[PDB]
Amino acid sequence: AQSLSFSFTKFDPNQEDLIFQGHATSTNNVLQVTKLDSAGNPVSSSAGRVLYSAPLRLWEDSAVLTSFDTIINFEISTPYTSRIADGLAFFIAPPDSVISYHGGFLGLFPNAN
Amino acid sequence: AQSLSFSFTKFDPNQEDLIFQGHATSTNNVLQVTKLDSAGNPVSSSAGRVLYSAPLRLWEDSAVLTSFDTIINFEISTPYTSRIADGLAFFIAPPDSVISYHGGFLGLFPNAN
Amino acid sequence: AQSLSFSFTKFDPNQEDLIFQGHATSTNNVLQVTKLDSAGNPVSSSAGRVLYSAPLRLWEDSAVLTSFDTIINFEISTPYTSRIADGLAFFIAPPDSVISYHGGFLGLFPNAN
Amino acid sequence: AQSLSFSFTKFDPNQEDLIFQGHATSTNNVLQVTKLDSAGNPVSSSAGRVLYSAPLRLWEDSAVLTSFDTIINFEISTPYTSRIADGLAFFIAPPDSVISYHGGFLGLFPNAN
Amino acid sequence: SNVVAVEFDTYLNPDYGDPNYIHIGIDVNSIRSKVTAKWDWQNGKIATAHISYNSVSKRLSVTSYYAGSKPATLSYDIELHTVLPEWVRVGLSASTGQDKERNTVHSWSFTSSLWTN
Amino acid sequence: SNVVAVEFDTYLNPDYGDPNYIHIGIDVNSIRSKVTAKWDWQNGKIATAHISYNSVSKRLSVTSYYAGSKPATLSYDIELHTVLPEWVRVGLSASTGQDKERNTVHSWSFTSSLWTN
Amino acid sequence: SNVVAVEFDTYLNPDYGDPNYIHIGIDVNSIRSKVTAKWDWQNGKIATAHISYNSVSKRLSVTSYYAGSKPATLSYDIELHTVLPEWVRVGLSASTGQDKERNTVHSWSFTSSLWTN
Amino acid sequence: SNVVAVEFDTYLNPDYGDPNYIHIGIDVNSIRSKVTAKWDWQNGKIATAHISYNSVSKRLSVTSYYAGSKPATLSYDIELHTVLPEWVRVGLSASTGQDKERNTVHSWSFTSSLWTN
Ligand SMILES: OC[C@H]1O[C@H](O)[C@@H](O)[C@@H](O)[C@@H]1O
Ligand SMILES: OC[C@H]1O[C@H](O)[C@@H](O)[C@@H](O)[C@@H]1O
Ligand SMILES: OC[C@H]1O[C@H](O)[C@@H](O)[C@@H](O)[C@@H]1O
Ligand SMILES: OC[C@H]1O[C@H](O)[C@@H](O)[C@@H](O)[C@@H]1O
Ligand SMILES: [Ca+2]
Ligand SMILES: [Ca+2]
Ligand SMILES: [Ca+2]
Ligand SMILES: [Ca+2]
Ligand SMILES: [Mn+2]
Numbered sequence A, B, C, D: 001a002q003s004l005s006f007s008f009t010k011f012d013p014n015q016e017d018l019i020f021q022g023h024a025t026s027t028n029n030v031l032q033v034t035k036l037d038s039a040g041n042p043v044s045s046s047a048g049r050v051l052y053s054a055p056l057r058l059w060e061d062s063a064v065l066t067s068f069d070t071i072i073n074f075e076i077s078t079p080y081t082s083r084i085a086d087g088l089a090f091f092i093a094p095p096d097s098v099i100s101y102h103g104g105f106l107g108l109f110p111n112a113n
Numbered sequence E, F, G, H: 001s002n003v004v005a006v007e008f009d010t011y012l013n014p015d016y017g018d019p020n021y022i023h024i025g026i027d028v029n030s031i032r033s034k035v036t037a038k039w040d041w042q043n044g045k046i047a048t049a050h051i052s053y054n055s056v057s058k059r060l061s062v063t064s065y066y067a068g069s070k071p072a073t074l075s076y077d078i079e080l081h082t083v084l085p086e087w088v089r090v091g092l093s094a095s096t097g098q099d100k101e102r103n104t105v106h107s108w109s110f111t112s113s114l115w116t117n
């Protein structure tokens, strides 16, 4: 009935086929989902999200098999010596989903229920 | 750098991953890019267009090979005995493209230059 | 490290890219893994197997994810009114594997251990 | 009717799914289509060929579109300072094809007609 | 109006350039087809069309058959990136006027690749 | 005899382990199915089956439907690489004995991926 | 808040449920992970993660390695379509608070299939 | 000797037809290239080449770059099925003679499709 497949190997500055929420951006061909110090150092209280433009069908009444595979290459680094926070996540949410609170929330949830 | 591939084999009524312009719609699992008589007969002066949700990168400064392949199954039929009009087209246009005049224009162009 | 993908939608008479064992053959674009009456009726005590030419890597010392998906369209039919036998199977076996006993064995195993 | 797709990103020592002809071999995860000095230096008068195990359908009576795309990453290097010879080639030949003369022949042809 | 389209034309418009017969055409920025080929339309049956492009062979090609009959082929040399921008959306479009016809699509499959340096 | 097979069994052989009904089974090194599920065979019509494996979810799964009816599902946890060697060939097999049935295959599609470190 | 996420957690929040160590988690509608596994993070290097789902094996699985070291694996059984709606968008998300870390993504590849009757 | 090959030639053999410079060539049944283009070889670095064919655009094309420099392109019109049989095997071949060079291959990726009626 439906099939969708997409691949990214560099991240163009003007990525018309991605949706950007929060301090998420892209430079030097990578995705900076978290705000950055004009010197290239991580900042505090930042939340960034990226969503693939197109919606995706996950299920349908008369349908019986749905499958998805995704591979991600990400780098969590810190120049500092303090503890590192917070998280990196791959998520699937209703199309109109919007970024939530930061911290140990990963811009995914508002509270802790 | 980038790759996009999608497949449709039925057309769901609520095709969240398609953009609809004009009298284009979908029922009985097919795409009716042209308005229809409540009895199932073709009407006059109709224009319908469908666009894949996601934008597509066609070219880039430091890039050297771009290729696309698409297969389409369409049916042009008429119950009547008069001449049939007008056209069916596969097109690639800037993302914000909007439907144009009908007739032998195929909702693609405004004039005839 | 490795990826293999193949698709068949018709079965040519001379399928150079398949290995044939037993009464397995092909005509009218389909795969007849079981012998047939010159009138087109199923026969008794028949065993047929087909193997994709190329070997397939299933695992490797420093490797961590192996996955395969296959879809099959098959038809088990009988013109007669007696009970139908025996079985249809999709199998993965060492490359030099050879057809075994028929019956409820499915040309897969010799005994019943 | 048919589709075949395969990918290699490393070359295992025992590549059961490749056919080897000539001094072609594999070590350190790469394909050495040309013989090598036990010190890792190129030798003279060498011919090596590799063929994908499975046969490939290129055409058929009632068939109308055949397409293939292949990407290759190869390295032609020489430690010496003399002129480098001879050639690297991607070829498609009948299944039973066997390696030919070396030199500027690229193990592809016997004479120069 | 910017666009590149491959068209299966059922109604002839000589004032628009259409040759005198059901044709399939490749259009670049204008309904005035750059190249055209005779297409044997068939009421009721369904058609399959493949369209392919390659920035290197600088060629765009179309082949359309009807299951059982001979296909129709058209090729035009272009360097798409001189005609269209860097970002595009792909679509199917159909229309009518004084005269009608049913414009229906059954399965549609599209795949694209871009390679950089 | 080494092999892993998913079977659609039409003839019951209680002495071989077959439960009392047309079933689909997952077999590891023996015709004595490790797990089995009721399959509603249908003479004349054609069946579609998907079989999937994943070294991480250590699960092998089958689903088979008949276009119009409810599907049949069976899952068994394995770590294939402990049962089979590093190099394998994939095949379809069918057989008969005192009793017959037509064993025909229409399209077959297979894709595989392996990832190293 | 509706969502299903796989997370690579660097900061521990016991009040939020986080066990006492850098972990990767599968979350269904809450930051309170349903299942969790120890992940050996590594500053500066880049990580590769594969996430896979199958409506039949009703299993969602993750494996993440670091090129050279041992991977980390986590699996949770779900029937995604009971938790999420019929239409979804897929994304990557990263955050910080009193404490920081660089959240960067290098290549991302995703493919999905759905089959009906 | 039957074969179609795309070649990256490092040693010139004027008696064999090779123009006077490192070139890439398309060959049909003979080492005597039908068409040829200047290729800027580079010792030590690795090269990426894409070769594509289409029975409709009756064109075979090659593009080879070196990561950082300008690519090299060659196209030749053929109808492969008039030159080669219905069944073929695809391969990579390299050779030397009085003079040497290391012939090594790193990843190789190939995909093919055929469509009937
Ligand atoms: O019906 C087809 C025909 O109808 C009218 O004459 C106009 O709208 C034309 O542009 C169109 O080609
Ligand atoms: O016909 C089916 C049945 O026939 C015979 O009894 C034997 O060959 C059995 O193994 C087989 O199951
Ligand atoms: O810096 C990490 C930490 O910072 C603060 O304490 C809060 O924002 C927490 O939610 C978060 O986990
Ligand atoms: O070394 C390259 C050169 O060596 C010899 O002269 C012969 O084998 C030639 O065919 C070849 O081109
Ligand atoms: Ca946390
Ligand atoms: Ca017209
Ligand atoms: Ca049995
Ligand atoms: Ca030469
Ligand atoms: Mn026209």
Ligand SMILES: [Mn+2]
Pocket (backbone or CB within 6 Å): F007, F009, F017, F018, F025, F031, F033
């Ligand atoms: Mn059984």
Ligand SMILES: [Mn+2]
Pocket (backbone or CB within 6 Å): G007, G009, G017, G018, G025, G031, G033
């Ligand atoms: Mn957590």
Ligand SMILES: [Mn+2]
Pocket (backbone or CB within 6 Å): H007, H009, H017, H018, H025, H031, H033
């Ligand atoms: Mn030459």
